[PDB]
PDB file of all heavy atoms in Angstrom:
ATOM      1  N   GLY P   1      -4.602   5.329  -5.920  1.00 30.88           N
ATOM      2  CA  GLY P   1      -5.382   4.572  -4.952  1.00 30.88           C
ATOM      3  C   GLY P   1      -5.475   5.246  -3.600  1.00 30.88           C
ATOM      4  O   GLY P   1      -5.168   6.433  -3.460  1.00 30.88           O
ATOM      5  N   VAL P   2      -5.902   4.481  -2.600  1.00 30.79           N
ATOM      6  CA  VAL P   2      -5.996   4.952  -1.227  1.00 30.79           C
ATOM      7  C   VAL P   2      -5.001   4.164  -0.384  1.00 30.79           C
ATOM      8  O   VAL P   2      -5.008   2.930  -0.401  1.00 30.79           O
ATOM      9  CB  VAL P   2      -7.431   4.773  -0.665  1.00 30.79           C
ATOM     10  CG1 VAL P   2      -7.452   5.048   0.830  1.00 30.79           C
ATOM     11  CG2 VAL P   2      -8.398   5.688  -1.382  1.00 30.79           C
ATOM     12  N   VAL P   3      -4.141   4.884   0.344  1.00 33.66           N
ATOM     13  CA  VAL P   3      -3.221   4.228   1.252  1.00 33.66           C
ATOM     14  C   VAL P   3      -4.005   3.500   2.325  1.00 33.66           C
ATOM     15  O   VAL P   3      -5.042   3.993   2.812  1.00 33.66           O
ATOM     16  CB  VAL P   3      -2.241   5.249   1.857  1.00 33.66           C
ATOM     17  CG1 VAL P   3      -1.471   4.634   3.001  1.00 33.66           C
ATOM     18  CG2 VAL P   3      -1.291   5.754   0.801  1.00 33.66           C
ATOM     19  N   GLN P   4      -3.550   2.296   2.687  1.00 33.24           N
ATOM     20  CA  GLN P   4      -4.230   1.459   3.667  1.00 33.24           C
ATOM     21  C   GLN P   4      -3.427   1.188   4.924  1.00 33.24           C
ATOM     22  O   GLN P   4      -4.012   1.052   5.987  1.00 33.24           O
ATOM     23  CB  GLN P   4      -4.611   0.113   3.028  1.00 33.24           C
ATOM     24  CG  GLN P   4      -5.700  -0.645   3.761  1.00 33.24           C
ATOM     25  CD  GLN P   4      -7.057   0.050   3.690  1.00 33.24           C
ATOM     26  OE1 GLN P   4      -7.298   1.031   4.394  1.00 33.24           O
ATOM     27  NE2 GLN P   4      -7.930  -0.470   2.839  1.00 33.24           N
ATOM     28  N   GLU P   5      -2.094   1.087   4.812  1.00 27.12           N
ATOM     29  CA  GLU P   5      -1.256   0.851   5.971  1.00 27.12           C
ATOM     30  C   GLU P   5       0.005   1.689   5.822  1.00 27.12           C
ATOM     31  O   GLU P   5       0.839   1.390   4.956  1.00 27.12           O
ATOM     32  CB  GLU P   5      -0.905  -0.629   6.120  1.00 27.12           C
ATOM     33  CG  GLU P   5      -0.437  -1.046   7.516  1.00 27.12           C
ATOM     34  CD  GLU P   5       1.005  -0.660   7.814  1.00 27.12           C
ATOM     35  OE1 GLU P   5       1.749  -0.375   6.866  1.00 27.12           O
ATOM     36  OE2 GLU P   5       1.380  -0.641   8.999  1.00 27.12           O
ATOM     37  N   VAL P   6       0.134   2.721   6.645  1.00 24.26           N
ATOM     38  CA  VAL P   6       1.291   3.608   6.647  1.00 24.26           C
ATOM     39  C   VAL P   6       2.159   3.228   7.829  1.00 24.26           C
ATOM     40  O   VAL P   6       1.663   3.047   8.941  1.00 24.26           O
ATOM     41  CB  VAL P   6       0.859   5.082   6.702  1.00 24.26           C
ATOM     42  CG1 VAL P   6       0.270   5.436   8.059  1.00 24.26           C
ATOM     43  CG2 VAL P   6       2.027   5.985   6.366  1.00 24.26           C
ATOM     44  N   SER P   7       3.466   3.097   7.589  1.00 26.76           N
ATOM     45  CA  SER P   7       4.378   2.642   8.633  1.00 26.76           C
ATOM     46  C   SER P   7       5.788   3.095   8.272  1.00 26.76           C
ATOM     47  O   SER P   7       6.037   3.589   7.178  1.00 26.76           O
ATOM     48  CB  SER P   7       4.305   1.119   8.779  1.00 26.76           C
ATOM     49  OG  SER P   7       4.964   0.482   7.695  1.00 26.76           O
ATOM     50  N   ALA P   8       6.705   2.908   9.217  1.00 28.04           N
ATOM     51  CA  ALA P   8       8.072   3.374   9.006  1.00 28.04           C
ATOM     52  C   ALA P   8       8.811   2.498   8.022  1.00 28.04           C
ATOM     53  O   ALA P   8       9.518   3.009   7.145  1.00 28.04           O
ATOM     54  CB  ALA P   8       8.824   3.400  10.349  1.00 28.04           C
ATOM     55  N   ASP P   9       8.674   1.177   8.144  1.00 28.78           N
ATOM     56  CA  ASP P   9       9.402   0.278   7.256  1.00 28.78           C
ATOM     57  C   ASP P   9       8.801   0.298   5.849  1.00 28.78           C
ATOM     58  O   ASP P   9       9.539   0.336   4.860  1.00 28.78           O
ATOM     59  CB  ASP P   9       9.380  -1.144   7.835  1.00 28.78           C
ATOM     60  CG  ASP P   9      10.008  -2.163   6.908  1.00 28.78           C
ATOM     61  OD1 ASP P   9      10.753  -1.774   5.988  1.00 28.78           O
ATOM     62  OD2 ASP P   9       9.752  -3.364   7.096  1.00 28.78           O
ATOM     63  N   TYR P  10       7.479   0.249   5.763  1.00 29.14           N
ATOM     64  CA  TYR P  10       6.802   0.043   4.482  1.00 29.14           C
ATOM     65  C   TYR P  10       5.478   0.789   4.456  1.00 29.14           C
ATOM     66  O   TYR P  10       4.925   1.132   5.503  1.00 29.14           O
ATOM     67  CB  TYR P  10       6.595  -1.452   4.224  1.00 29.14           C
ATOM     68  CG  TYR P  10       5.695  -2.173   5.215  1.00 29.14           C
ATOM     69  CD1 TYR P  10       4.306  -2.003   5.201  1.00 29.14           C
ATOM     70  CD2 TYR P  10       6.217  -3.087   6.121  1.00 29.14           C
ATOM     71  CE1 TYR P  10       3.494  -2.661   6.090  1.00 29.14           C
ATOM     72  CE2 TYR P  10       5.410  -3.753   7.009  1.00 29.14           C
ATOM     73  CZ  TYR P  10       4.047  -3.541   6.990  1.00 29.14           C
ATOM     74  OH  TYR P  10       3.231  -4.210   7.880  1.00 29.14           O
ATOM     75  N   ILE P  11       4.977   1.025   3.243  1.00 28.63           N
ATOM     76  CA  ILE P  11       3.691   1.677   3.049  1.00 28.63           C
ATOM     77  C   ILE P  11       2.904   0.883   2.009  1.00 28.63           C
ATOM     78  O   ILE P  11       3.436   0.574   0.938  1.00 28.63           O
ATOM     79  CB  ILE P  11       3.824   3.135   2.608  1.00 28.63           C
ATOM     80  CG1 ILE P  11       2.467   3.704   2.185  1.00 28.63           C
ATOM     81  CG2 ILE P  11       4.800   3.279   1.443  1.00 28.63           C
ATOM     82  CD1 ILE P  11       2.403   5.186   2.232  1.00 28.63           C
ATOM     83  N   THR P  12       1.642   0.589   2.304  1.00 27.06           N
ATOM     84  CA  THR P  12       0.797  -0.225   1.447  1.00 27.06           C
ATOM     85  C   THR P  12      -0.248   0.644   0.755  1.00 27.06           C
ATOM     86  O   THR P  12      -0.940   1.419   1.413  1.00 27.06           O
ATOM     87  CB  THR P  12       0.099  -1.322   2.248  1.00 27.06           C
ATOM     88  OG1 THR P  12      -0.917  -0.744   3.071  1.00 27.06           O
ATOM     89  CG2 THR P  12       1.106  -2.054   3.128  1.00 27.06           C
ATOM     90  N   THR P  13      -0.360   0.485  -0.563  1.00 26.55           N
ATOM     91  CA  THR P  13      -1.314   1.221  -1.368  1.00 26.55           C
ATOM     92  C   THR P  13      -2.215   0.251  -2.124  1.00 26.55           C
ATOM     93  O   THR P  13      -1.783  -0.843  -2.519  1.00 26.55           O
ATOM     94  CB  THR P  13      -0.623   2.151  -2.384  1.00 26.55           C
ATOM     95  OG1 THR P  13       0.450   1.442  -3.020  1.00 26.55           O
ATOM     96  CG2 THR P  13      -0.074   3.373  -1.682  1.00 26.55           C
ATOM     97  N   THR P  14      -3.448   0.678  -2.319  1.00 22.94           N
ATOM     98  CA  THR P  14      -4.505  -0.148  -2.899  1.00 22.94           C
ATOM     99  C   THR P  14      -5.220   0.666  -3.963  1.00 22.94           C
ATOM    100  O   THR P  14      -5.769   1.738  -3.663  1.00 22.94           O
ATOM    101  CB  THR P  14      -5.494  -0.602  -1.834  1.00 22.94           C
ATOM    102  OG1 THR P  14      -6.353   0.488  -1.468  1.00 22.94           O
ATOM    103  CG2 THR P  14      -4.743  -1.031  -0.582  1.00 22.94           C
ATOM    104  N   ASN P  15      -5.221   0.190  -5.200  1.00 23.15           N
ATOM    105  CA  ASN P  15      -5.952   0.852  -6.266  1.00 23.15           C
ATOM    106  C   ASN P  15      -7.387   0.350  -6.353  1.00 23.15           C
ATOM    107  O   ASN P  15      -7.750  -0.711  -5.811  1.00 23.15           O
ATOM    108  CB  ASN P  15      -5.281   0.649  -7.611  1.00 23.15           C
ATOM    109  CG  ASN P  15      -5.393   1.841  -8.521  1.00 23.15           C
ATOM    110  OD1 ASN P  15      -4.737   2.866  -8.328  1.00 23.15           O
ATOM    111  ND2 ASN P  15      -6.246   1.732  -9.543  1.00 23.15           N
ATOM    112  N   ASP P  16      -8.224   1.122  -7.057  1.00 22.82           N
ATOM    113  CA  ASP P  16      -9.610   0.707  -7.281  1.00 22.82           C
ATOM    114  C   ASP P  16      -9.683  -0.626  -8.020  1.00 22.82           C
ATOM    115  O   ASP P  16     -10.633  -1.395  -7.816  1.00 22.82           O
ATOM    116  CB  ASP P  16     -10.389   1.769  -8.059  1.00 22.82           C
ATOM    117  CG  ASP P  16      -9.551   2.473  -9.117  1.00 22.82           C
ATOM    118  OD1 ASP P  16      -8.435   2.005  -9.398  1.00 22.82           O
ATOM    119  OD2 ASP P  16     -10.027   3.494  -9.669  1.00 22.82           O
ATOM    120  N   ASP P  17      -8.711  -0.913  -8.869  1.00 25.24           N
ATOM    121  CA  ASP P  17      -8.724  -2.188  -9.595  1.00 25.24           C
ATOM    122  C   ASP P  17      -8.646  -3.372  -8.620  1.00 25.24           C
ATOM    123  O   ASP P  17      -9.336  -4.371  -8.815  1.00 25.24           O
ATOM    124  CB  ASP P  17      -7.571  -2.232 -10.602  1.00 25.24           C
ATOM    125  CG  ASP P  17      -6.211  -1.969  -9.975  1.00 25.24           C
ATOM    126  OD1 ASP P  17      -5.954  -2.436  -8.857  1.00 25.24           O
ATOM    127  OD2 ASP P  17      -5.408  -1.249 -10.615  1.00 25.24           O
ATOM    128  N   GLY P  18      -7.816  -3.248  -7.586  1.00 23.51           N
ATOM    129  CA  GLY P  18      -7.675  -4.290  -6.593  1.00 23.51           C
ATOM    130  C   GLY P  18      -6.238  -4.618  -6.281  1.00 23.51           C
ATOM    131  O   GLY P  18      -5.959  -5.283  -5.263  1.00 23.51           O
ATOM    132  N   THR P  19      -5.311  -4.184  -7.112  1.00 24.29           N
ATOM    133  CA  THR P  19      -3.901  -4.484  -6.903  1.00 24.29           C
ATOM    134  C   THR P  19      -3.402  -3.813  -5.634  1.00 24.29           C
ATOM    135  O   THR P  19      -3.627  -2.617  -5.407  1.00 24.29           O
ATOM    136  CB  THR P  19      -3.071  -4.026  -8.104  1.00 24.29           C
ATOM    137  OG1 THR P  19      -3.191  -2.609  -8.255  1.00 24.29           O
ATOM    138  CG2 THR P  19      -3.547  -4.715  -9.375  1.00 24.29           C
ATOM    139  N   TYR P  20      -2.697  -4.581  -4.803  1.00 20.14           N
ATOM    140  CA  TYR P  20      -2.059  -4.093  -3.597  1.00 20.14           C
ATOM    141  C   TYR P  20      -0.565  -4.057  -3.843  1.00 20.14           C
ATOM    142  O   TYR P  20      -0.003  -5.029  -4.364  1.00 20.14           O
ATOM    143  CB  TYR P  20      -2.364  -4.991  -2.395  1.00 20.14           C
ATOM    144  CG  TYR P  20      -3.806  -5.003  -1.963  1.00 20.14           C
ATOM    145  CD1 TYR P  20      -4.738  -5.776  -2.641  1.00 20.14           C
ATOM    146  CD2 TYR P  20      -4.227  -4.265  -0.883  1.00 20.14           C
ATOM    147  CE1 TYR P  20      -6.063  -5.792  -2.247  1.00 20.14           C
ATOM    148  CE2 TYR P  20      -5.558  -4.279  -0.483  1.00 20.14           C
ATOM    149  CZ  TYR P  20      -6.468  -5.040  -1.171  1.00 20.14           C
ATOM    150  OH  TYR P  20      -7.787  -5.056  -0.769  1.00 20.14           O
ATOM    151  N   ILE P  21       0.099  -2.954  -3.482  1.00 19.23           N
ATOM    152  CA  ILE P  21       1.554  -2.889  -3.572  1.00 19.23           C
ATOM    153  C   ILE P  21       2.102  -2.224  -2.320  1.00 19.23           C
ATOM    154  O   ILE P  21       1.580  -1.210  -1.867  1.00 19.23           O
ATOM    155  CB  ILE P  21       2.030  -2.129  -4.839  1.00 19.23           C
ATOM    156  CG1 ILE P  21       1.482  -0.705  -4.863  1.00 19.23           C
ATOM    157  CG2 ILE P  21       1.626  -2.903  -6.088  1.00 19.23           C
ATOM    158  CD1 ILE P  21       1.799   0.051  -6.136  1.00 19.23           C
ATOM    159  N   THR P  22       3.161  -2.808  -1.776  1.00 18.04           N
ATOM    160  CA  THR P  22       3.785  -2.333  -0.542  1.00 18.04           C
ATOM    161  C   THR P  22       5.179  -1.848  -0.888  1.00 18.04           C
ATOM    162  O   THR P  22       6.080  -2.647  -1.191  1.00 18.04           O
ATOM    163  CB  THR P  22       3.846  -3.450   0.493  1.00 18.04           C
ATOM    164  OG1 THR P  22       4.901  -4.355   0.180  1.00 18.04           O
ATOM    165  CG2 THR P  22       2.520  -4.200   0.560  1.00 18.04           C
ATOM    166  N   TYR P  23       5.367  -0.534  -0.858  1.00 19.39           N
ATOM    167  CA  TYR P  23       6.685   0.054  -1.035  1.00 19.39           C
ATOM    168  C   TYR P  23       7.507  -0.169   0.218  1.00 19.39           C
ATOM    169  O   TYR P  23       7.053   0.121   1.335  1.00 19.39           O
ATOM    170  CB  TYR P  23       6.569   1.545  -1.341  1.00 19.39           C
ATOM    171  CG  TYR P  23       5.607   1.894  -2.443  1.00 19.39           C
ATOM    172  CD1 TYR P  23       4.286   2.210  -2.156  1.00 19.39           C
ATOM    173  CD2 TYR P  23       6.021   1.919  -3.762  1.00 19.39           C
ATOM    174  CE1 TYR P  23       3.402   2.527  -3.153  1.00 19.39           C
ATOM    175  CE2 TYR P  23       5.134   2.237  -4.768  1.00 19.39           C
ATOM    176  CZ  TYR P  23       3.827   2.541  -4.463  1.00 19.39           C
ATOM    177  OH  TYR P  23       2.949   2.861  -5.460  1.00 19.39           O
ATOM    178  N   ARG P  24       8.719  -0.689   0.040  1.00 17.07           N
ATOM    179  CA  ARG P  24       9.654  -0.923   1.123  1.00 17.07           C
ATOM    180  C   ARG P  24      10.671   0.217   1.145  1.00 17.07           C
ATOM    181  O   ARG P  24      11.517   0.315   0.246  1.00 17.07           O
ATOM    182  CB  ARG P  24      10.359  -2.270   0.976  1.00 17.07           C
ATOM    183  CG  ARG P  24       9.430  -3.433   0.623  1.00 17.07           C
ATOM    184  CD  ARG P  24       8.316  -3.591   1.641  1.00 17.07           C
ATOM    185  NE  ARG P  24       8.836  -3.749   2.991  1.00 17.07           N
ATOM    186  CZ  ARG P  24       9.302  -4.880   3.497  1.00 17.07           C
ATOM    187  NH1 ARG P  24       9.359  -5.997   2.781  1.00 17.07           N
ATOM    188  NH2 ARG P  24       9.743  -4.894   4.751  1.00 17.07           N
TER     189      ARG P  24
END
Protein backbone atom coordinates (compact mmCIF):
# COMPACT_ATOMS: atom_id res chain seq x y z
CA GLY A 1 0.00 0.00 0.00
CA VAL A 2 0.85 3.69 0.40
CA VAL A 3 1.96 5.03 3.77
CA GLN A 4 -0.39 7.77 4.97
CA GLU A 5 0.87 8.90 8.40
CA VAL A 6 4.53 8.48 9.36
CA SER A 7 5.45 9.26 12.96
CA ALA A 8 7.79 8.27 15.77
CA ASP A 9 5.29 6.30 17.84
CA TYR A 10 3.36 4.66 15.00
CA ILE A 11 3.12 4.36 11.22
CA THR A 12 -0.14 3.98 9.29
CA THR A 13 -0.39 2.05 6.03
CA THR A 14 -3.31 1.82 3.61
CA ASN A 15 -3.78 -0.84 0.94
CA ASP A 16 -5.72 -0.47 -2.30
CA ASP A 17 -8.35 -2.81 -0.84
CA GLY A 18 -9.10 -0.28 1.91
CA THR A 19 -7.69 -1.92 5.03
CA TYR A 20 -5.83 0.49 7.33
CA ILE A 21 -3.20 -0.84 9.73
CA THR A 22 -1.10 1.16 12.20
CA TYR A 23 2.15 -0.45 13.29
CA ARG A 24 3.05 0.55 16.84
